[PDB]
Design a protein around this ligand. Structure first.
Ligand SMILES: [K+]
Ligand SMILES: [K+]
Ligand SMILES: [K+]
Ligand SMILES: [Mg+2]
Ligand SMILES: [Mg+2]
Ligand SMILES: [Mg+2]
Ligand SMILES: [Mg+2]
Ligand SMILES: [Mg+2]
Ligand SMILES: [Mg+2]
Ligand SMILES: [Mg+2]
Ligand SMILES: [Mg+2]
Ligand SMILES: [Mg+2]
Ligand SMILES: [Mg+2]
Ligand SMILES: [Mg+2]
Ligand SMILES: [Mg+2]
Ligand SMILES: [Zn+2]
Lengths: 91, 58
RNA sequence: GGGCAAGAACAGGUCAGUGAUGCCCUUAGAUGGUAUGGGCUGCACGCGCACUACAGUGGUCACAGCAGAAACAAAUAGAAGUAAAUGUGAUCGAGAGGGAAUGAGCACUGUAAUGUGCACAGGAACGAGGAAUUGCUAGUAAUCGUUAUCUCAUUAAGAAG
RNA sequence: GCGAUAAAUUUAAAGGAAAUUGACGGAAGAACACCACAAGGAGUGGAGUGUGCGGCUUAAUUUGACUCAACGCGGGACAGCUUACCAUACCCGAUGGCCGUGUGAGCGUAGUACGCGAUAGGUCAGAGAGUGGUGCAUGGCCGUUAACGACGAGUGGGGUG
């Protein structure tokens, strides 16, 4: 997918910090909150959707990504956070 | 595209004194950090992070 | 004066509007993207729809003057913009009507002229149209301009007002 | 010419009978309408140009649509983009199994010894993508019948239907 290891962990932490992501299709521009190329962010999240970790809904020109509960844990193992840590959407 | 030859375990970059102290055998780049070493072939000395080739006057 | 507008139909049109879609096909030497160019605008020829005409109920010069309403740096020949038919006086006198093909120029838009504007030359057919054929009953037809409407970097002889 | 009267062969029904609903009539009777006419008015068809269509040419001149209801139509006024077509060049690949890998998978290079490192290796399954095909596999939306007077439900009546 052609992302650096730094860029990969930047997406992992964002997607855990906030339980959602929003990406614009057919764009060579940079994602406002990450400073990563839009097509590359789409391609990264694509894998998480295929793995069944993330829902995808496509509306007009935007892809809305939602992290499932049964995948918060997988991303918590992957990102090696403490067992007490949860997203802003989870009390 | 072409095939990539491989040189196994890279240890040739260094030399070891009788005291066990180690020093680089190839010379080192001034502008890419001293941790980047410089190749040799004929009139050419060359570098990695910059692809710059020096041409010797010999 | 518009707008909304039965039931039933049609193997009527669109997979080239669609993260609407079944099935077949291709898929790193791609039928996927991108970039630089060329074409879509080629020319013996037959057709459909529009635009200027064939003059005197005209052409040319100047002067006025009126819309739907309200937006307009500057510019010394000239190089987008707030009507035009029209009203008065002059002029021209029966191809001084008409502006097609073309020359060396002078500018503008643009990443790039091949596109557009301007000045000078040049001056083709056409002298009211065979067989046929299309709308239109009143502020209608026909005439005359105009779009802070749509296309639009620049381009209307197109639509929609 | 008449009277009287066979076979071989062929075939699933027969312009067989009466009635019913439609479609049609160079049948009758009512209505209606300048996409009909009468009474009129302006044109189109002829000329030059703008634009679309066929034919032929080309490396490519990408393509749909054909009586009304194809042909300034696809919001189709194409220098790039649009753009599907032609010439050259460059770039890429969900996941899962197996195997192989930091003693270095693969990548960059003035390509061989230097720089970067799991990211992007091979093979089987399986995804996804495509202005690629089929509107005679569809949905949606349009146009046309038609802007026409018709249109079905419940209860009663008649007929074997
Ligand atoms: K005519
Ligand atoms: K049309
Ligand atoms: K349909
Ligand atoms: Mg059909
Ligand atoms: Mg064309
Ligand atoms: Mg004249
Ligand atoms: Mg048009
Ligand atoms: Mg007899
Ligand atoms: Mg008549
Ligand atoms: Mg004509
Ligand atoms: Mg009709
Ligand atoms: Mg191109
Ligand atoms: Mg394309
Ligand atoms: Mg498609
Ligand atoms: Mg059909
Ligand atoms: Zn260097």
């Amino acid at each position: 997918m052609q992302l650096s290891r730094e860029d990969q962990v930047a997406i992992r932490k964002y997607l855990f910090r906030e339980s959602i992501c929003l990406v614009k299709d057919k764009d060579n521009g940079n994602h406002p909150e990450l400073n990563i190329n839009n097509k590359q962010v789409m391609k990264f999240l694509r894998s998480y959707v295929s793995r069944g970790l993330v829902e995808k809904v496509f509306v007009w020109q935007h892809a809305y990504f939602l992290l499932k509960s049964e995948g918060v844990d997988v991303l918590r193992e992957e990102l090696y956070l403490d067992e007490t840590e949860v997203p802003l959407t989870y009390m | 595209k072409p095939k990539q030859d491989i040189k196994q375990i890279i240890l040739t970059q260094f030399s070891v004194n009788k005291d066990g102290e180690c020093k680089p055998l190839r010379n080192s780049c001034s502008t890419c950090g001293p941790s980047v070493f410089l190749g040799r072939s004929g009139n050419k000395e060359y570098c990695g992070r910059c692809y710059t080739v020096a041409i010797l006057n010999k």
